[PDB]
């Protein structure tokens, strides 16, 4: 009703498109533009105060991009399919010194997404849950964000019960990828800060902006 999963799906479908780290950073910068477009299509997001929109995306962008790259990659063996039509294989990530983080993405996200055949609706909903993070520092109205989160997961749950009546734990199994996503997010972010600090990797403007105070 107020948080229709078909709209969340529509948001997902609407934005559908040398150095592995460089490619990743390049793909992330381009995908940040489309993430903004994605968020505007999440019911009620555009009705939040503009500062809260800014806060939710600054708090979530890395988790949200990781979620997308991971789900986009369920059809490949040991790599990630980035938005731009390029792949990054495990070996290539290992060769660039980011094998551990990359493997975590493969093992905790891509593989688990594949094993349960997480669909686009469930991904979108998980993403909207991540976007509506009421813990984000500075929100004008944390409770409204928590409410929107609640509406999303109520809808996701009903959706899973209807579409997967066979699997009573699927809803929880979905939500229980969120911690790994949080963790992997934080790690990918620290890597990124290091890349910027060292100056070893070109970082485009919107990605750069996301890494500013």
């Amino acid at each position: 009703e107020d948080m229709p999963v078909e709209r969340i799906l529509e948001a997902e479908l609407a934005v559908e498109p040398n150095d592995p780290v460089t490619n990743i950073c390049q793909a992330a910068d381009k995908q940040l533009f489309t993430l903004v477009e994605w968020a505007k299509r999440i019911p009620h997001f555009s009705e939040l105060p503009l500062d809260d929109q800014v806060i939710l995306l600054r708090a979530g962008w890395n988790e949200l991009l990781i979620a997308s790259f991971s789900h986009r990659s369920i059809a490949v063996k040991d790599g990630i399919l980035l938005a731009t039509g390029l792949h990054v294989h495990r070996n290539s990530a290992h060769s660039a010194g980011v094998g551990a983080i990359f493997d975590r993405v493969l093992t905790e996200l891509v593989s688990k997404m594949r094993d349960m055949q997480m669909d686009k609706t469930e991904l979108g909903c998980l993403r909207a849950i991540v976007l509506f993070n009421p813990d984000s520092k500075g929100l004008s109205n944390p409770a409204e964000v928590e409410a929107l989160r609640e509406k999303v997961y109520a809808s996701l749950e009903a959706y899973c019960k209807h579409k997967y009546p066979e699997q009573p734990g699927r809803f929880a199994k979905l939500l229980l990828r969120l911690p790994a996503l949080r963790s992997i997010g934080l790690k990918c972010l620290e890597h990124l800060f290091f890349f910027k600090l060292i100056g070893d990797t070109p970082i485009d403007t919107f990605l750069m902006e996301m890494l500013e105070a």
Partner: peptide, 10 residues
């Protein structure tokens, strides 16, 4: 945060 604000307007 220049770019994010701009892209959020239209």
């Amino acid at each position: 945060h220049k770019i994010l604000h701009r892209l959020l307007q239209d």
